[PDB]
């Protein structure tokens, strides 16, 4: 990985780029014929929002997602990981990948509400004052439809609307 640094000495500014140690893919993949890191390791339809060891390999130090042309993922799996990372941040599973706070900012104390499987951003959700009738009920979304084809070990399929 590459890094950039700025050193100021004698009112003169210098900018440099230095290479750093870079991680290497583990050898002997199960499926060398796979096209992206997911099928090469037989992980398709077998990960969820809570599998952070997998999700951390595709995000930046501040919680942002990495490009698809870099990771090599398929558009189908890049969208799943992009949504599973959103739900991991909201559940508090990536506490060391927080946004960069500019100098002179102290986040205010806010109500700590524990949550998981959070599809939408909290602030952009309005309350359901009128549930509606039984045949036109306004449901509450839980999870993501992008993870609907995941391996279910139960007889009842994934319920995405409560």
């Amino acid at each position: 990985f590459r890094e950039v640094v700025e050193t100021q000495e004698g009112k003169t500014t210098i900018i440099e780029g230095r290479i750093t140690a870079t991680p290497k893919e583990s050898p002997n993949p199960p499926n060398p014929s796979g096209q992206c890191p997911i099928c090469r390791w037989n992980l398709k339809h077998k990960y969820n929002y809570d599998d952070v060891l997998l999700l951390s390999q595709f995000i930046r130090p501040h919680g942002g997602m990495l490009p698809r042309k870099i990771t090599g993922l398929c558009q189908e799996e890049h969208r799943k990981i992009e949504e599973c990372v959103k739900m991991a941040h909201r559940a508090g599973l990536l506490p060391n990948h927080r946004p960069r706070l500019p100098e002179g900012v102290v986040p205010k104390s806010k109500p700590q509400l524990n949550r998981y499987l959070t599809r939408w951003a909290p602030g952009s959700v309005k309350p359901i004052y009128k549930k509606g009738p039984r045949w036109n009920r306004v449901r509450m979304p839980v999870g993501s439809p992008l993870l609907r084809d995941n391996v279910c070990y139960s007889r009842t399929p994934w319920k995405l609307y409560h």
């Binding site: 002997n28 993949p29 199960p30 499926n31 390791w41 037989n42 992980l43 077998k46 997998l54």
Partner: peptide
């Protein structure tokens, strides 16, 4: 040390 059907 990984078989064809190995899943992490």
């Amino acid at each position: 040390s990984y078989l064809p059907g190995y899943v992490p």
